[PDB]
Amino acid sequence: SSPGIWQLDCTHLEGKVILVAVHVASGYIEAEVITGQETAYFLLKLAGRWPVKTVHTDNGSNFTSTTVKAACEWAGIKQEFGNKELKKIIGQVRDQAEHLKTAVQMAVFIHNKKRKGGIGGYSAGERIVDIIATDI
Amino acid sequence: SSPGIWQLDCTHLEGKVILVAVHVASGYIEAEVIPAGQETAYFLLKLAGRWPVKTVHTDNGSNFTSTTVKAACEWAGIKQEFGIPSMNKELKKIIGQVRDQAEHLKTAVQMAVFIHNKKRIGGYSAGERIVDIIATD
Numbered sequence: 001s002s003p004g005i006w007q008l009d010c011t012h013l014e015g016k017v018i019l020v021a022v023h024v025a026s027g028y029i030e031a032e033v034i035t036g037q038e039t040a041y042f043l044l045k046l047a048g049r050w051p052v053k054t055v056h057t058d059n060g061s062n063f064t065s066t067t068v069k070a071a072c073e074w075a076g077i078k079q080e081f082g083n084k085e086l087k088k089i090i091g092q093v094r095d096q097a098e099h100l101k102t103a104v105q106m107a108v109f110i111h112n113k114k115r116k117g118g119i120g121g122y123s124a125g126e127r128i129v130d131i132i133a134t135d136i
Numbered sequence: 137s138s139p140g141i142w143q144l145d146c147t148h149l150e151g152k153v154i155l156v157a158v159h160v161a162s163g164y165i166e167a168e169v170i171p172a173g174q175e176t177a178y179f180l181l182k183l184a185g186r187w188p189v190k191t192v193h194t195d196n197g198s199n200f201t202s203t204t205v206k207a208a209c210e211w212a213g214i215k216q217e218f219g220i221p222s223m224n225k226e227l228k229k230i231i232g233q234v235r236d237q238a239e240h241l242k243t244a245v246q247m248a249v250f251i252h253n254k255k256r257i258g259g260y261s262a263g264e265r266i267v268d269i270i271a272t273d
């Protein structure tokens with residue numbers, strides 16, 4: 001388990017690259033449409049917001065990025081080794097913005113607020129706060 | 137000045153804007169470097185995706201002259217109230233302390249937000265205040 005474990009990825013749409021982070025214990029995500037310095041910033045933003053102790057990615061691309069290695073060193077983040085749902089909502093909302101950016105962040109909003117349990121139970125937004133909260 | 141109640145307002149350095157959302161109860165803050173209500177409407181919708189944002193307070197009229205902002209607030213259920221019931225100072229201080237450690241301004245900004253939100257012997261952090269507030273409720 002843990003409060004500050006996260007997973008990292010890139011997904012793609014419109015020829016644009018959607019940087020996406022998940023909280024693994026909650027499923028809470030934060031995305032951006034964005035290279036190596038955007039992601040550092042991303043990570044830096046994330047890290048001042050949540051406890052971020054460890055970030056897993058699937059490829060080797062991040063182990064090789066100067067700005068990211070320095071972001072993680074400043075913020076105290078270990079990098080370690082080891083979407084299709086998001087894209088559905090962007091669909092339902094894509095016409096509702098001229099910008100793919102705006103569409104990525106409505107679906108984040110929907111993903112995070114809707115009920116995990118579908119009807120009862122918490123949403124991902126509530127959980128990452130509960131988990132964390134439970135911790136202290 | 138309590139539940140999902142944030143203050144929003146601007147500050148400037150090195151010829152730029154920094155939007156600054158302040159969660160009134162915790163002292164928690166987010167920030168973004170921006171070209172001045174298109175870009176302002178992206179920061180509220182992400183926020184509202186991170187947290188519970190019901191009322192946004194501004195102490196000027198700019199926010200209301202922007203349909204993109206107004207569009208974002210209606211989508212999210214954010215109440216745009218007028219009237220904000222010196223953080224920028226503190227933060228600009230910290231930015232002040234750290235600017236040389238990164239290249240673009242937006243990095244040191246995010247570094248300043250990090251320090252403001254995680255640093256309290258003291259007792260609790262702005263970042264810990266907001267998580268608890270939101271838990272209880």
Ligand SMILES: Cc1ccc2oc(C#Cc3cccc(C(=O)NCCN4CCN(C(=O)c5cccc(C#Cc6oc7ccc(C)cc7c6CC(=O)O)c5)CC4)c3)c(CC(=O)O)c2c1
Nearest residue numbers: 038041044071097098099102175177207208238239240243
């Ligand atoms: C209903 C409704 C509601 C809301 C709506 O909103 C819109 C819209 C729009 C719009 C359009 C254009 C632009 C924008 C806008 O606001 N852009 C700015 C935001 N930006 C975020 C994303 N970022 C970036 O990653 C970025 C860029 C440059 C550099 C970096 C970095 C870094 C960095 O980190 C570090 C951390 C640690 C260490 C040790 C070093 C480093 C370094 C290295 C360094 O030292 O350098 C990051 C830069 C800043 C918004 C619509 C319209 C529509 O679609 O219908 C709409 C409709």
